[PDB]
Amino acid sequence: DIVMTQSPLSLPVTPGEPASISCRSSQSLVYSNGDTYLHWYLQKPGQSPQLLIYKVSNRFSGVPDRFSGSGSGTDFTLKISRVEAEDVGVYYCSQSTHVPWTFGQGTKVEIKRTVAAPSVFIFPPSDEQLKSGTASVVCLLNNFYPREAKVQWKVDNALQSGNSQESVTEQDSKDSTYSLSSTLTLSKADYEKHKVYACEVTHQGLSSPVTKSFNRGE
Amino acid sequence: EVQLVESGGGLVQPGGSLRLSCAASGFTFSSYGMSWVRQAPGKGLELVASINSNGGSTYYPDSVKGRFTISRDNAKNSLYLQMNSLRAEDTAVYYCASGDYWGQGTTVTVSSASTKGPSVFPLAPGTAALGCLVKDYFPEPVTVSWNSGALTSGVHTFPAVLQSSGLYSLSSVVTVPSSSLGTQTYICNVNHKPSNTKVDKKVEPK
Amino acid sequence: HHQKLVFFAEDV
Known part of the structure; x- marks a missing residue:
């Protein structure tokens, strides 16, 4: 060919x-x-x-x-x-x-466009979802440029792998930025035998990687 | 007006069969070669099958050879793609194409999953971020809006993700002034036509 | 709107 x-x-x-x-x-x-x-x-x-x-x-x-x-x-x-x-x-x-x-x-x-650092937000699983037997932890990277970005999940200081999925928006027509979501999925049992949930973001607009976290039950 | 309208797409079980049809008009169909081209989301253009004027002679890449058949009807001016023994990688948007023209494409989804409405969970919140997690629905698509179409600015509905379960999931977020997290209601309007489900989940803090 | 090309070389 x-x-x-x-x-x-x-x-x-x-x-x-x-x-x-x-x-x-x-x-x-x-x-x-x-x-x-x-x-x-x-x-x-x-x-x-x-x-x-x-x-x-x-x-x-x-x-x-x-x-x-x-x-x-x-x-x-x-x-x-x-x-x-x-x-x-x-x-x-x-x-x-x-x-x-x-x-x-x-x-x-x-x-x-000019380099723009992402705004990062972390979201614990709803009490509704936890009730149904599943836990989803979402991390949002809002309005950044360029598209290149790394997101790492840490559960009790332990680096996570294979249990998360990402999703990116197409370049916004107004501000020319992207937005990205990383969803960490665990069983209800696994979610409860841990405490600290952290999302770590690396991007060209960030001098050092930023980390948004929460403790289970706050 | 050259025209290429495809049909026959939709949901198919693994190993099942699907037949694509392409209605051509606006030119002397019998005189030109035709092809089916497919495309996965975020992927490049992949040739699936070609066929010359009379057809005649055909081509298939090893990707689909032996499972797919391309045929032609120079009376109806129609292009056909017979898809047998379908597998998961056959999932794509399929285009009827003449090289100089492309149809709007038809979607083929190879899955054994059944129709299911989503469970909507809150993503609780000088700007704040809040959203909705629209999880475990099938199939594509889903429509999300905020405050009955009144909240549009700063809204980010992410493309869907296929989970290991076979069910789609997406999030829809929006950034708003944090000074309004008490003097303003925030409700995501979720609609899933296949299962005919409408959900209005309220996103409150705490 | 109505232009048709001999696109693929196989069509002489």
């Missing part, structure tokens, strides 16, 4: 600045008719992929002038002369010269 690899795979762009995306094919995409079937897709958040540029440089319908494409053989580039808020999403390069039809990994273009 023809391998399509893009770079970068994550592209934060300051509004007003241009953007470039590299795309390389493992073999030449020049078909027997001299045409090169290298294409570009844009998939806006919560939507189907739409053809942006076909055959290296030709703009599809509706595509603004700021989008342009170039390249030959195995090397190709997609340029956005000035990134607008509407251009947010994932860009795929793709070839249709060979079978099978293949895609690149996809480059997610986001809005670049």
Whole structure:
């Protein structure tokens, strides 16, 4: 199969600045008719992929002038002369010269903004939930940038693993920040044979990792 | 107007069968190649099956080869995907595609879980944070709102998570002035259409 | 709205 690899795979762009995306094919995409079937897709958040540029440089319908494409053989580039808020999403390069039809990994273009430290909150399991036989401990990381963040659970100073799940929001349209939730799940019995529950957060906006905790029964 | 409308998605038991249909219009269908492409949440575009003009010749990656069949009806102008022996990794959004056009996609969920309404638990609270834990429901989706659609600013409803039990879970949070944690009520309106459940959980401190 | 491309090379 023809391998399509893009770079970068994550592209934060300051509004007003241009953007470039590299795309390389493992073999030449020049078909027997001299045409090169290298294409570009844009998939806006919560939507189907739409053809942006076909055959290296030709703009599809509706595509603004700021989008342009170039390249030959195995090397190709997609340029956005000035990134607008509407251009947010994932860009795929793709070839249709060979079978099978293949895609690149996809480059997610986001809005670049100043580093923002997360606000951290911890939530003990409700007395309702505890009654039903289960305990969920939730940790919220609110409005931070960039997306990169580490969350560690500590039950009585013991590092937890394998019993938590995370969930991240898509970049907010107003403040360009993310929010993240980490949910620690334990049996009611396990939850009661311990006392201290702590959420520890590491982020670029934090000089040192912050810790929000509670004691069971307060 | 080129059009690609898919059908046949939904819930399937493991090892069961599902058949996808794609209604095409607006162009001479019989003259072009067609494909089914799928996508997992937060994942890339994965080719599932291709088929040429007359079909003719087909392609399947080893991921689905031997279990999936792609076929074509150049009278109805319809594209089909016959899915047999479905497993958990077959769970995705499936797109009917012509390369230059993509349908809106149809969702396929391979699970043996049964329809269940969520239990809603409080996430008790110069700004404070409070929320609701909407746990153990099936299947997707769920709708969450705060104060009957009056509280919208600062609301974060996280994407759902598939637990080991086979049941989905999500949280919905919102940050508000801590000076209002006594002069303001905070109720999350949760709705789960599959089980037809409506829950208005009050989120009080303490 | 109505443009149709010969997209896949297999279609000459």
